[PDB]
Design an enzyme around this catalytic site. Structure first.
Site, PDB file in Angstrom:
ATOM      1  N   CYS A  33       6.039  -1.834   4.490  1.00 51.49           N
ATOM      2  CA  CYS A  33       7.049  -1.643   3.458  1.00 51.49           C
ATOM      3  C   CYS A  33       6.365  -1.844   2.109  1.00 51.49           C
ATOM      4  O   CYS A  33       6.484  -2.882   1.457  1.00 51.49           O
ATOM      5  CB  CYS A  33       8.213  -2.600   3.662  1.00 51.49           C
ATOM      6  N   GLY A  34       5.651  -0.804   1.696  1.00 54.41           N
ATOM      7  CA  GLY A  34       4.555  -1.001   0.773  1.00 54.41           C
ATOM      8  C   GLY A  34       3.607  -2.029   1.340  1.00 54.41           C
ATOM      9  O   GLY A  34       3.227  -1.983   2.516  1.00 54.41           O
TER      10      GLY A  34
END
Lengths: 217, 129, 247, 321, 72, 247, 72
Positions: free
Chosen positions: D88-89
């Site tokens: 998530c990034g």
């Protein structure tokens, strides 16, 4: 046009007329060129001429080569392109500044036309079609462009005016490589980024506006 | 009175009402039409609304309340609907909590279990209600 | 096409008229001349073309001309051959071509007659030198309105226009109106629809694109701006709708 | 072969559609999260109003709250709100590397680095950094509720209620941008005597006017503004009376305020994970359509190549028939 | 098959029969359709006929076109 | 090949038996006269193709027919030329064969032996009319999961198995599993394989695939499904690998 | 893709079929949302359900033809 000569072949020419008008321009160039003047040629374009010679030896059913060009087209280009020189002072230092248009078929650098076209040309000037889509004619994708003599005829005025600009454009590409990450661009990042974005504004001109070498530097 | 019940995640019973009453540190007080400007903390114990027809429990496991000019600002720490909890379920969780209260030694764990049992007796209580 | 060009070359000289030249499909003509090279036994070129298909294509292409008496102005149809921008056929056509234009599936889906591609045309004569910075500036801003609008259309679909900028709320309503005022009563639509077909003046489009691009006409609904090419017609039907809600 | 080229082109198209889908999907997730963190603004708002109220009325040199009892510098605990889904990034890895820096910080102060943990990826990063005290690992709390807040809140309250953990700190990337979030450790324990919470960097965040993520589109890219509106700073009434205690009500509101900041911190880390995932998928969609154009370019190049092989087959016939 | 006639080219068909039997079915449709009747035809893949006419023009020693199908 | 066909007519026409006709290499059988046409001076067809090779393989397949006398069951086999399916050999062969089997060099890349092209081997007798809606329904569910598995596998290799939803990942499990349990051993294979081959009866694996799409041995591994005979033998291999995981 | 269109459709069909087209393209763009359709909006998951039932309203086996009216 006082200082020029318009070599005009209509699009609907003989393919041989297309396939030879290069040589006509070569001769007319050689006139002022062996009249020792500076001279300059602008071919636009050998690509249509490549199609022509393809069509010509194709009509001969001479079996053409990679991407349906016959082979000697490059040799024809070598018939064409090998004329241009700042000639000897023994010859009289006559300059023949030929520079052709080179049609980017889909940006395919391995078009056999472009593939040959680079191989002769001592400089390679690749344009910016995305900046053409940005309307930013004079639109030059300067990294992919190249020229061997970058400052040997660029003046001490020009070289000492724009070597900083050269590296400013390069570092503008560098801080333009991947500026979509940091999310608060520091004055290092942002000031070089807006300095080079300003450079991106700065090279831009209205078309047909030949500015002074004075105004250039 | 305008009960603005407010968990730290939701405005729980923002219904204005006829009557509410609260677990005081005196043990319970009741709200009162145009009560005092006053404020009260509530332990882990069921608040109640004797609103217009119904007297029923508001299962809070801690909080405070600004009782303004018939203006309840009752912000709990965790206020369940004691109607919503299954009596057997929260009674079973209360059983497990009393047992683990017998299990947890050590000051942080002992207090965690005892307050867990506090909120759990509160849970079972309005779950019994 | 040669028969077409000669019959047109009468009226481009004999009538000296502004010779409209609709020709569909030019890629089919290319394929036909390719077939003529096939039946010729000519060693024909790459991906299926004749060798001199470039030459014949010029020969067809050249006669479309603004001569000093009449102007052979052509709209032709390139079947996108396998959508290949690398098609030398599409290359030759685009070389002959002047204005690449799509017509919008998605705005016939949005209902717009005429369903012109709001983003997917191209105008080679669109230098502000050539087209006029009146037209060029105005349409550049119009393109920007379209660009931001469709570009964050999905963003506002996630967000609500409330979460978008008021700028964007000016932009999205403005460009919804721009597409709406872009929906114009075609002359041929008067058969199928019955609305009188507004032959929209260029300056009418200029002022209308100005007004909606200004947001001076921000009180006009896109509901009111729809089906209305003409600028004063859009404000007038805004009054007509205001009265019909008032009556 | 040509069809494999066309095939992976379509694969790139499938993943590109999916990439835009993932960017917009976690954008919707983060939109409901923006709704979520705003959905408690009344609770912490009236809380802080009563907080400055009874802190004015508190006025004492003798009373105390147990959370307000700053204890001996023996063991600091580290609270790690995190993200859950991987990649998530890299808010996971950036906050975890900053957490490793915090492990170094609490190894530099000698304050016996206990580590509270949130998030299943945070749980796995704690589980893969096995040389630390993992205090109470909280799960990946998908749109975390006040229940899990109450639970890990109680974990905080019990342990920091002991001197055992003295003066614990809470690491979370506050959702500043949809693009930037380095981790920030707000000073979690001991509770703030002003009520104005601090950073573990040391920066006293204001009691009254503080930042909170919201999202707005300045131009066609939708954006993130960590906006700050100050709540009502009236006290409780002069007609209002403390029905139980000043001191015990301070001691009680400490659990409430600790819970409020903790729920907000978990919301901050979750929204940061949602945003960074969204940004990664958006940038991926850009790279995707780029690679798509490159692939289709070589595809039509190979189309010319197949045509050239056909031309070769034509050419042999010219001597043949 | 009450409503349907059937014509077929073999896989072992002489490709003349393949190469025209399409037009034969078309004329069958003509005998129905010039008789003002609704009528429908189901042309099994003329790509087979394309390989056939490929075999024809190559069999004719004739000029081969785009991927060996004749331009005709 | 025609000599084989003549013996085939002697046994299926003339001796009229339910004939068994192993026939390969049919792509080399193409390749020869394919090579010989230019040796004949018959003109260049496609990429190695002879011109009327269409009709040649048509006479091959049409000669390979179950007469009313005998059933000429015919094992035909061509090299799928460099796994190019549009290559004119298999292109011509597609109408020719009744039941056809591409193999999967992906499944051979998955290491299966049998490496059946799971989506890509079809039959005339593949029908609920023919195989039974038990069998056709089972394969409907089976190939359904297999196809969406191949589909979502792209978002897997881009997006990780973490990206998987519930039924998607269950299908993914089902995919790797039913892949592996679809692989069986041949007693032929036992030097290149080294395993005991089980002549796997059909309804046994109908039960096993009904169980696999039923998720019964979802407990078991695809390692425990890899190259085995029975679903009971699969559960047995699960027992073996489980006790080995104890060791 | 086809050329003739509503001249070939019953208006009987056409009244439903335009909505079929609209919902079909709607679900077609929204075919991306599927694996993340847990976080789907009410009209998003609802149009997804509508296009889902419409997608169910497609399939037919070998020789599962229907009349116009049953399809209507």
């Amino acid at each position: 046009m006082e200082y020029t000569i318009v070599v005009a072949e209509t699009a609907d020419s003989p393919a041989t007329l297309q396939y030879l008008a290069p040589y006509t321009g070569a001769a007319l160039a050689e006139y002022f060129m062996y009249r020792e003047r500076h001279t300059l040629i602008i071919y636009d374009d050998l690509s249509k001429q490549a199609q022509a010679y393809r069509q010509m030896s194709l009509l001969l059913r001479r079996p053409p080569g990679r991407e349906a060009y016959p082979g000697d087209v490059f040799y024809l280009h070598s018939r064409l392109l090998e004329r241009a020189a700042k000639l000897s002072s023994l010859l009289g230092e006559g300059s023949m500044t030929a520079l052709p248009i080179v049609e980017t078929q889909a940006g395919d650098v391995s078009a056999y036309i472009p593939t040959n076209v680079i191989s002769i040309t001592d400089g390679q000037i690749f344009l910016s079609a995305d900046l053409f889509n940005a309307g930013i004619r004079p639109a030059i994708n300067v990294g992919i462009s190249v020229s061997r003599v970058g400052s040997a005829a660029q003046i001490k005025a020009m070289k000492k005016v724009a070597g900083k600009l050269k590296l400013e454009l390069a570092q503008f590409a560098e801080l333009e490589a991947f500026a979509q990450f940091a999310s608060d661009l520091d004055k290092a990042t942002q000031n070089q980024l807006a300095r080079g974005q300003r450079l991106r504004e700065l090279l831009k001109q209205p078309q047909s506006a030949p500015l002074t070498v004075e105004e250039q530097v | 009175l305008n009960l603005c019940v407010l968990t730290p995640n939701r405005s729980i019973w923002n219904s204005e009402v006829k009557e509410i009453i609260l677990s005081t540190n005196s043990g319970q007080i009741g709200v009162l039409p145009n009560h005092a400007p006053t404020a009260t903390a509530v332990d882990i114990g069921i608040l109640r609304i004797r609103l217009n027809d119904q007297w029923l429990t508001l299962a809070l496991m801690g909080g405070f309340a600004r009782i303004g000019n018939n203006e309840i600002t009752i912000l709990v720490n965790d206020a369940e609907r004691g109607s919503d909890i299954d009596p057997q379920e929260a009674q079973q969780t209360l059983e497990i909590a009393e047992a683990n209260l017998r299990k947890a030694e050590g000051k942080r764990q002992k207090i965690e279990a005892n307050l867990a049992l506090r909120r759990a007796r509160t849970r079972v209580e309005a779950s019994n209600t | 096409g040669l028969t077409a060009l000669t019959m047109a070359e009468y009226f481009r000289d004999v009538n000296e008229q502004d010779v409209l030249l609709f020709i569909d499909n030019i890629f089919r003509f290319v394929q036909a001349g390719s077939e003529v090279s096939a039946l010729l036994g000519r060693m024909p070129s790459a991906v299926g073309y004749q060798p001199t298909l470039s030459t014949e294509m010029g020969s067809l292409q050249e006669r479309i001309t603004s001569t000093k008496e009449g102007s052979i102005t052509s709209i032709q149809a390139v079947y996108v051959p396998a959508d290949d921008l690398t098609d030398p056929a599409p290359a030759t056509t685009f070389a002959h071509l002047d204005a690449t234009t799509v017509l919008s599936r998605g705005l016939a889906a949005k209902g717009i007659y005429p369903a012109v591609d709001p983003l997917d045309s191209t105008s080679t004569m669109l230098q502000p030198r050539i087209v006029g910075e009146e037209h060029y500036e105005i349409a550049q801003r119009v393109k920007e309105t379209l660009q931001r609008y469709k570009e964050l259309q999905d963003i506002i679909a996630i967000l609500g226009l409330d979460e978008l900028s008021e700028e964007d709320r000016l932009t999205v309503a403005r460009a919804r109106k721009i597409e709406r005022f872009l929906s114009q009563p075609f002359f041929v639509a008067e058969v199928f629809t019955g609305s009188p077909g507004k032959y929209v003046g260029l300056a009418e489009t200029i002022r209308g694109f100005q007004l909606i691009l200004s947001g001076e006409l921000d009180s006009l609904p896109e509901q009111a701006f729809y089906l209305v090419g003409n600028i004063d017609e859009a404000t007038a039907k805004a009054m007509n709708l205001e009265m019909e809600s008032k009556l | 072969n040509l069809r494999e080229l066309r095939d992976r082109i379509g694969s790139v198209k499938n993943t590109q559609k999916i990439t835009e889908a993932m960017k917009l999907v976690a954008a919707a997730k983060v939109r409901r999260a923006q709704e979520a963190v705003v959905n408690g603004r009344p609770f912490s708002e009236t809380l802080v109003e009563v907080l400055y109220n009874m802190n004015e009325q508190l006025q004492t040199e003798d009373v105390d709250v147990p959370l307000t009892k700053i204890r001996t510098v023996k063991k600091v605990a580290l609270m790690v709100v995190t993200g859950d889904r991987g990649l998530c990034g890299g808010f996971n890895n950036m906050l975890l590397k900053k957490a490793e820096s915090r492990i170094a910080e609490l190894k530099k102060l000698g304050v016996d680095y206990t580590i509270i943990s949130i998030g299943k990826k945070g749980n796995t990063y704690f589980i893969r950094r096995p040389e630390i005290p993992v205090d109470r690992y909280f799960d990946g709390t998908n749109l975390p509720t006040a229940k899990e807040a109450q639970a890990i809140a109680d974990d905080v309250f019990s342990l920091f209620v002991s001197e055992e953990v003295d003066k614990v700190e809470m690491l979370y990337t506050k959702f500043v941008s949809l693009v930037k979030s380095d981790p920030v450790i707000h000073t979690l324990l001991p509770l703030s005597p002003k009520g104005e919470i601090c950073d573990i960097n040391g920066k006293c965040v204001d009691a009254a006017e503080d930042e909170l993520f919201r999202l707005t589109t300045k131009e066609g890219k939708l954006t993130v503004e960590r906006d700050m509106i100050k709540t009502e700073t009236p006290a409780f009434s002069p007609i209002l009376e403390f029905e139980q205690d000043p001191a015990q009500i301070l001691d009680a509101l400490l659990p409430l305020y600790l819970n409020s900041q903790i729920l907000r911190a978990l919301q901050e880390s979750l929204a940061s994970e949602l945003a960074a995932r969204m940004t990664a998928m958006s940038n991926a969609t850009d790279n995707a359509n780029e690679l798509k154009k490159t692939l289709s370019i070589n595809y039509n190049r190979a189309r010319q190549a197949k045509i050239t092989g056909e031309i070769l087959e034509i050419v042999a016939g010219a001597n043949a028939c």
